[PDB]
Design a protein around this ligand. Structure first.
Ligand SMILES: O=P(O)(O)O[C@H]1[C@H](O)[C@@H](O)[C@H](OP(=O)(O)O)[C@@H](OP(=O)(O)O)[C@H]1O
Length: 118
């Protein structure tokens, strides 16, 4: 169960179990594994390229990527580089970076992960 990609992104929840939510954008240390996206309030104390950081570091949340859906976040945010993710329990969120190459890489990595879970 380990790390395909990790990085800081801006994130907001859009819906939880299909209930719409008021956006609340903010920075998150994001960790993509082969089956999940895990969100941390902040990045590791050190060795951030390792993804998880210390084992005692607790995540705020994570989602199951099996059968998740990806889409451009244009209709849900005015932020330039925005990706919308919807997972099968009906959680929806936006990921966003000020750097399009960063967000582009996340888009491609996330897709590949969902695809390997079919
Ligand atoms: O003004 P505060 O309470 O901080 O919250 C806003 C954010 O600051 C904006 O970034 C949101 O718009 P974008 O998602 O288009 O960036 C904006 O989204 P909205 O204008 O589409 O509702 C709000 O979520």
């Amino acid at each position: 169960h380990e790390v395909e990609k990790s990085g800081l992104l801006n994130m907001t929840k859009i819906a939880q179990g299909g209930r719409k939510l008021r956006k609340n954008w903010g920075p998150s240390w994001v960790v993509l594994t082969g089956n999940s996206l895990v969100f941390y309030r902040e990045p590791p104390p050190t060795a951030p390229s390792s993804g998880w950081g210390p084992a005692g570091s607790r995540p705020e949340s994570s989602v199951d990527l099996r059968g998740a859906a990806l889409a451009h976040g244009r209709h849900l945010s005015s932020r330039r580089n925005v990706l919308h993710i919807r997972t099968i329990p009906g959680h929806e969120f936006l990921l966003q970076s000020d750097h399009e190459t960063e967000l582009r890489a996340w888009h491609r990595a996330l897709r590949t992960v969902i695809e390997r879970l079919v």
